[PDB]
């Protein structure tokens, strides 16, 4: 429970996030013994680790690893959202925006992957 600035404007939410995102970082005698609780706790922890590493892998594929805000080279296409700038970042919440562009996430991911392939080719061409 650390959903700071949830439901506020996307711009205000991002301005808050620039500071907030950097804030990251005898039961066993009874629990985890003579019952199914050990397996459940291990499953929860392993699932959390799996999701964390999947997110970090997905960031790495786009070349955005090690960043919280990473600008990309993919040009935004208007077909994904008829609203323009300052209407998304003003008078709109993060949840509303995510529900608005839920459908095009796969397309955006494919474009990001192609972009990163081209960036790697440019870097190899730099040598």
């Amino acid at each position: 429970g650390f959903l700071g600035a949830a439901g506020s404007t996307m711009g205000a939410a991002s301005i808050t996030l620039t500071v907030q995102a950097r804030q990251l970082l005898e039961c066993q005698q009874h629990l985890l013994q003579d019952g199914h609780w050990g397996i459940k706790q291990l499953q929860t922890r392993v699932l959390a680790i799996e999701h964390y590493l999947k997110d970090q892998q997905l960031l790495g594929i786009w070349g955005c690893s090690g960043k919280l805000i990473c600008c990309t080279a993919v040009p935004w296409n208007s077909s994904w959202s008829n609203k323009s700038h300052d209407e998304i970042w003003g008078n709109m919440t993060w949840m509303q925006w995510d529900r608005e562009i839920s459908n095009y996430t796969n397309t955006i991911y494919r474009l990001l992957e192609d972009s990163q392939n081209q960036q790697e080719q440019n870097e190899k061409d730099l040598l």
């Binding site: 939410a13 996030l17 990473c70 600008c71």
Partner: protein, 447 residues
């Protein structure tokens, strides 16, 4: 103009994870003889926060909430584990010679030949068993004793509840794991489903007592607002109706019998406790409830039901006859399992268009909890008379009226499904998974 990837975005999705129990360590982990204290050992932090989310509307639904299923499974598993190492009373299921006159019928002076630590030796025993706990082999003849056997011996083995272990409820908190959060709706008039306009995120639920009852919810949490009626589909009369009271009602129940508890050895390191003797007269167990408060509460509930069921006459009545498990207000009172005939309470009529009510109650020892046919437990008696006070905070109502006679609606006590009890406490919560990855356009690019 350009895509940009944001991490740490405050976006969540509906999800289902395995919450971990947590409870107050102070004054509960000192001795750890309680089941709920030995389990749920995670100490709760002092003063959990409530990050209020301004201008957020979230779609809640108390029914079809996985938290209720988790709590039900946890309670079942904990009781199973508590009964798991205790003694089995399979050796005691023998022919039971009983005399209806236990000198000076609810209780019978029964005798049997139990086993001992030595296999080729049998201990002759006398024990006072409640008539509900016994079924007959021979049709009874008043002129002499008759042969009986324990109830649910042909069905399954009987596992005595350990005398050292106590099932007294304590306030336990459910807490979400890392990467999840619990949303609490603070509407104060939330009708059980649909959007809620005042939500706040918490790491742990408020204190919940896992109470066991069938008709009247006990020791719960009073609703902030007025009396709230909740039901999945009020048009569907089959579904149970949950009522939260904004004012508690006091119920006091007592076993006025001065029992003496004798113990014998059945096997190696295996004791067995039984009602050795009764001192003084024999009086039924009864419950007292405030009369004026109960009448006012019933009147207000009738008013609310009439509001939800306009153009009708609201009638409260006793439940239709049947099994004792479903037609009586059952509960646990200091290890004794009561069963109360609440006909005297649900007798009033519709809301118009000092003194206390005495309720008779029966007590059993051999319990078949949660309708789990194939399992049973024997609750040993306790020396001295028993008293216990409780706060009635809710009612479980079932709407009848298939005939649709006149313009009269009939409500009866519900029960039989324990999930309703915990849904009455977990209605306001919802588990959500954070999805920190997010995308939005902006003006700056890689360059």
């Amino acid at each position: 103009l350009w895509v940009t990837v944001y991490y740490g975005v405050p976006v969540w999705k509906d999800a289902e994870t395995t919450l971990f129990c947590a409870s107050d360590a102070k004054a509960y982990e000192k001795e750890k003889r309680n089941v709920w204290a030995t389990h749920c050992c995670v100490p709760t932090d002092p003063n959990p926060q409530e990050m209020v989310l301004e201008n957020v509307t979230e779609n809640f639904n108390m029914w079809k909430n996985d938290m209720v299923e988790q709590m039900h499974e946890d309670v079942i598993s904990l009781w199973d584990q508590s009964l798991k190492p205790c003694v089995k009373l399979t050796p005691l299921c023998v022919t039971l010679e009983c005399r209806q006159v236990n000198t000076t019928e609810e209780i019978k002076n029964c005798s049997f030949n139990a086993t001992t630590e030595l296999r080729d030796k049998k201990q002759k025993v006398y024990a006072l068993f409640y008539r509900l706990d016994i079924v007959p082999l021979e049709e009874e003849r008043k002129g002499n004793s008759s042969k009986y056997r324990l109830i649910n011996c042909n069905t399954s083995a009987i596992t005595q509840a350990c005398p050292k272990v106590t099932f007294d409820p304590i306030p336990i908190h459910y807490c979400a794991p890392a990467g999840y959060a619990i949303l609490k709706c603070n509407n104060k008039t939330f009708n059980g489903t649909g959007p809620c306009n005042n939500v706040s995120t918490v790491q742990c639920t408020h204190g919940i007592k896992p109470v066991v009852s069938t008709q009247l919810l006990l020791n719960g949490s009073l609703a902030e607002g007025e009396i709230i009626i909740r039901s999945e589909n009020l048009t569907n009369n089959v579904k149970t109706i949950i009522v939260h009271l904004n004012e508690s009602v006091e119920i006091v129940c007592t076993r006025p019998n001065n029992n003496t508890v004798k113990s014998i050895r059945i096997g190696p390191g295996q004791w067995f406790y039984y009602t050795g003797d009764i001192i003084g007269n024999i009086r039924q167990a009864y419950c007292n409830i405030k009369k004026d408060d109960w009448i006012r509460t019933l009147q207000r509930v009738g008013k609310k039901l009439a509001e939800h069921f306009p153009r009708r006459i609201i009638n409260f009545t006793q439940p239709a006859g049947g099994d004792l498990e479903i037609t009586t207000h059952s509960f646990n009172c200091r290890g004794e399992f009561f069963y109360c005939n609440t006909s005297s309470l649900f007798n009033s009529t519709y809301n118009p268009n000092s003194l206390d009510i005495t309720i008779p109650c029966r007590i059993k020892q051999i319990i078949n909890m949660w309708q789990r046919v194939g399992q049973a437990m024997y609750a040993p008696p306790i020396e001295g008379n028993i008293t216990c006070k409780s706060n009635i905070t809710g009612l479980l109502l079932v709407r009848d009226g298939g005939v649709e006679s006149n313009e009269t609606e009939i409500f009866r006590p519900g029960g039989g499904d324990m999930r309703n009890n915990w849904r009455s406490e977990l209605y306001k919560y919802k588990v959500v998974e954070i999805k920190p990855l997010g995308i939005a356009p902006t003006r700056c690019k890689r360059r």
